């Protein structure tokens, strides 16, 4: 179950990294206009 | 004890996810993205 | 726009705080 | 001035976030 949890941590981190990339993409468009 | 500590890590990354979802939605609304 | 951006900033404080906690917890688990 | 200042603040916090994401990635592999 440790391996299961490590996998879950990794999946969550990937999800969160995408969302940070989204914040970066969107904030540049507020800045832009 | 690795299990309890990793469970706590997962819960906190879920809070992170919740917050980031809120921020992303708020910025999409600002730029008119839907 | 300013008001919304201010809330974005404030919520990102929470994101980083939570992440700091996670890093700290892993460090004590691995013995760093 | 204020929008630009707030965008800069957002980008600084994201920078800190990216580093922390990297650290979580490094640390969890060591478990
Ligand atoms: Mg929170």
Contacts of C among chains (3+ CB pairs under 8 A): A, B, D
How was this one solved?
X-ray
Around ion ligand 1, which residues have CB less than 5 A away? Answer: B 15; C 14
CA distance linking residue B27 with residue B8, whole number of Å: 29
Q: How many domains does chain D have?
A: 1
Choose, out of B1, B2, B5, B24, the residue to mutate when testing the contact with C (most C CBs < 10 Å).
Answer: B5
Q: In Å, what resolution does this model reach?
A: 1.7
In terms of Cα–Cα distance, which of D13, A18, A29 is closest to B28? A29
CA distance linking residue D13 with residue C32, whole number of Å: 25
In terms of Cα–Cα distance, which of B22, A29, B2, D29 is closest to C18? B22
CA distance linking residue D10 with residue C15, whole number of Å: 12
Helix H or strand E segment including B32: none
- Both tokens of D2, joined, read 């204020």
Q: Which residues 1-30 of D are in CB contact (within 8 Å) with C?
A: 2-3, 6-7, 9-10, 13-14, 16-17, 20-21, 23-24, 27-28, 30
- Option in C12, C19, C29 nearest B5 (CB): C29
Q: What is the domain extent for residue A30? A: 1-33
User: How far away, in angstroms, is A33 Cα from ligand 1 center?
Assistant: 30
CA distance linking residue B6 with residue A3, whole number of Å: 10
């Amino acid at each position: 179950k440790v391996k299961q949890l490590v996998d879950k941590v990794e999946e969550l981190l990937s999800k969160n990294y995408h969302l940070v990339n989204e914040v970066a993409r969107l904030v540049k468009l507020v800045g832009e206009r | 004890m690795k299990v309890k500590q990793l469970e706590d890590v997962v819960e906190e990354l879920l809070s992170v996810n919740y917050h980031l979802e809120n921020v992303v939605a708020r910025l999409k609304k600002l730029v008119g993205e839907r």
